[PDB]
Design a protein around this ligand. Structure first.
Ligand code: A1AYN
Length: 209
């Protein structure tokens, strides 16, 4: 059972801008997704400070980067607080309408796309490098769900039948044909060292057979 939703007009316009604007500094997508993961890990850690049982779904707080050249996917896994189904439909837990408003005023006032994270909509920078994004998420208060969009004005949500996550979020980037450099180990290492050196959670870059 698959539900198809229309993006709010402002969010569709944000992703069309990300997809269509000539902008060579695409590597910042990884910084933005790791920062989102760090924020989600902060949230479940804070909740656990007064309720240890919040970590019954998994005590380890970390970020994994999983490239797969055969599938042409880069997956960012975290064990953060996750998202409910309502969070997913409500723009992945962002205030994306007002954030897009401010981002687009900043762009006409000198800003560039790399500053997208300062407006709370850094997730959508995934479409700098991905033709399709799948988000698998499990929140303590809900079931496991899969969100998916190839842009074009719509997204889908379904109950996920993949591997149980326990708790957290998995962002699967189905990379564009000309963006496979972000599957190479040395390129990912360079980006993490450049932009994510002070993230307070272990970031593990998986290797491939
Ligand atoms: N080791 S892990 O981070 O739990 C993991 C590996 C995949 Cl392939 S998908 C996913 Cl989640």
């Amino acid at each position: 059972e698959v539900e198809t939703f229309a993006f709010q007009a402002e969010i569709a316009q944000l992703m069309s801008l990300i997809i269509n604007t000539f902008y060579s500094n695409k590597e910042i997508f990884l910084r933005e997704l790791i920062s989102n993961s760090s924020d989600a890990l902060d949230k479940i850690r804070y909740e656990s400070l007064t309720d240890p049982s919040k970590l019954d779904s998994g005590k380890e707080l970390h970020i994994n980067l999983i490239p797969n050249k055969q599938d042409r996917t880069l997956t960012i896994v975290d064990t953060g607080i996750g998202m409910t189904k309502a969070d997913l439909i409500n723009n992945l837990g962002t205030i994306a309408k007002s954030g897009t408003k401010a981002f687009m005023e900043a762009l006409q006032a000198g800003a560039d796309i790399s500053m997208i994270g300062q407006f709370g909509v850094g997730f959508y920078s995934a479409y700098l490098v991905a033709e399709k994004v799948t988000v698998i998420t499990k929140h303590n208060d809900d079931e496991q769900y899969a969100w998916e969009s190839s842009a074009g004005g719509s997204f889908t949500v379904r109950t996920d039948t993949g591997e149980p996550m326990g708790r957290g979020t998995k962002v699967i980037l189905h990379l564009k044909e000309d963006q496979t450099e972000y599957l190479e180990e040395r390129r990912i290492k360079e980006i993490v060292k450049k932009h994510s050196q002070f993230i307070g959670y272990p970031i593990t870059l998986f290797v491939e057979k």
